[PDB]
User: Which sequence fits this backbone?
């Protein structure tokens, strides 16, 4: 599964979390077996103004 | 005072049941002994521990 979020919301991409990303965008199950991989992409996904 | 053998059988059972109920008040190292209190203070993965 792939998407973009702000750095402070990366903590919500984990089992049993709450907050606007975990609640309204992407919810993981509590028994999640898997890996969560993230990296800062401000050199590509970001623009002046 | 002659019936001490029978009265002590009542006393030992009352003392054992009160001890079993009093142990509901103990923390066993948890944040609180009130089970709904844990579920208010903490989110799912921390509350489960």
Assistant:
């Amino acid at each position: 599964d792939s998407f973009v979020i702000r750095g402070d919301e990366v903590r919500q991409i984990a089992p049993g979390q709450t907050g606007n990303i975990a609640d309204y965008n992407y919810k993981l199950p509590d028994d999640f077996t898997g890996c969560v991989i993230a990296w800062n992409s401000n050199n590509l996904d970001s623009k002046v103004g | 005072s002659a019936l001490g053998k029978l009265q002590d059988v009542v006393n030992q059972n009352a003392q054992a049941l009160n001890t079993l109920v009093k142990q509901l008040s103990s923390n066993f190292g948890a944040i609180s002994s009130v089970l709904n209190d844990i579920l208010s203070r903490l989110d799912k993965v921390e509350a489960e521990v």
About this structure: Chain A touches chain B through five residues (CB under 8 Å). Chain A has one helix and no strands.
